[PDB]
């Protein structure tokens, strides 16, 4: 919009606060077609909300325990969610009904994701494994003995040929989806738990979060750390982190000081901090085409806020 596309700093501003979840919100995700927003919560439910007006839409349910993650498919037609009931469920966002219940993990399922071709589901559990599922057959294709502690994040690259995973075991791993073979391990000489990780939108980099109030940008081919983003508080929870591109080029993340941080990807300088939540901001999301950010707070707050910028 009106400010650059390479502005000095953006001016995100609160436009809506969504309320409905009776417990702590875990994550929020904008549909690929940018029309919706889905949120998972400790209250065992998933909620859909209009991306631009914030208006409540529907409540998809079925999980027996808490849901720590929820993700969309490319066609914006399905959702997958990681629950403490030890399962993952495929959902028809249209009918709100549960299509498949992926059974296999022996502990909580902490994270999940579809591949671009939406025929596969990657999952991360407490049991320290990473599983690849078949969306149609609802069966498990592989059980990667990925880490030696709980797995905090799982993500596919542009063509779903690679899977990146994180764990409290202080490790970041890249997997070959086809063979399930461990291709690379991003390591550190301190080994702080890795709370989050994700491929960049061009696939050349990995954005990772460690519980030492730090965010890192990695060149995975080279296995080198290019950027280090700091200034916030993250030592206890697994806060998702995003790549903002629609307007400027930022790295966005929730925080434990109840704020939302926005950093310049190149300079690593904080450019803006969104104030409004009254408890840790565990999840943020960046709108696919418009400068819209979606933040979600913990039980102490229980809301979701939508911020728009120029």
């Amino acid at each position: 919009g009106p400010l650059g596309s390479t502005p000095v700093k953006p001016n995100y501003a609160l436009k809506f606060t969504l309320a409905g979840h009776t417990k702590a919100v875990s994550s929020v995700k904008f549909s690929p077609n940018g029309e919706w927003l889905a949120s998972s919560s400790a209250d065992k439910l998933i909620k859909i909300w209009g991306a631009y007006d914030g208006k409540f839409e529907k409540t998809i349910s079925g999980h027996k325990l808490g849901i720590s993650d929820v993700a969309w498919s490319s066609d914006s037609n399905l959702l997958v969610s990681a629950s403490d009931d030890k399962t993952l469920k495929i959902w028809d966002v249209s009918s709100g009904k549960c299509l498949k219940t992926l059974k296999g993990h022996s502990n909580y399922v902490f994270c999940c994701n579809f591949n671009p071709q939406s025929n596969l589901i990657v999952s991360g559990s407490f049991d320290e494994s990473v599983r690849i599922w078949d969306v149609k057959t609802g069966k498990c294709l592989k059980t990667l003995p990925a880490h030696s502690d709980p797995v905090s994040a799982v993500h596919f690259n542009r063509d779903g040929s690679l899977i990146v995973s994180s764990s409290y075991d202080g490790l970041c791993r890249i997997w070959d989806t086809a063979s399930g073979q461990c291709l690379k391990t991003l390591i550190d000489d301190d080994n702080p738990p890795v709370s989050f990780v994700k491929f960049s939108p061009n696939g050349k980099y990995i954005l990772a979060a460690t519980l030492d109030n730090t965010l890192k940008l990695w060149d995975y081919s080279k296995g080198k750390c290019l950027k280090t983003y700091t200034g916030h508080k993250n030592e206890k929870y697994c806060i998702f982190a995003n790549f903002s591109v629609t307007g400027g080029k930022w790295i966005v993340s929730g925080s434990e000081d109840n704020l939302v941080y926005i950093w310049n990807l190149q300079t690593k300088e904080i450019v803006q901090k969104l104030q409004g939540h009254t408890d840790v901001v565990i999840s943020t999301a960046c709108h696919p085409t418009e400068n819209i950010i979606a933040s979600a707070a913990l039980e102490n707050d229980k809301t979701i806020k939508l911020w728009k910028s120029d």
């Binding site: 994550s27 919560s41 808490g66 849901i67 697994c238």
Partner: peptide
């Protein structure tokens, strides 16, 4: 749950 430490 992601909402618990």
């Amino acid at each position: 749950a992601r909402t618990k430490q």
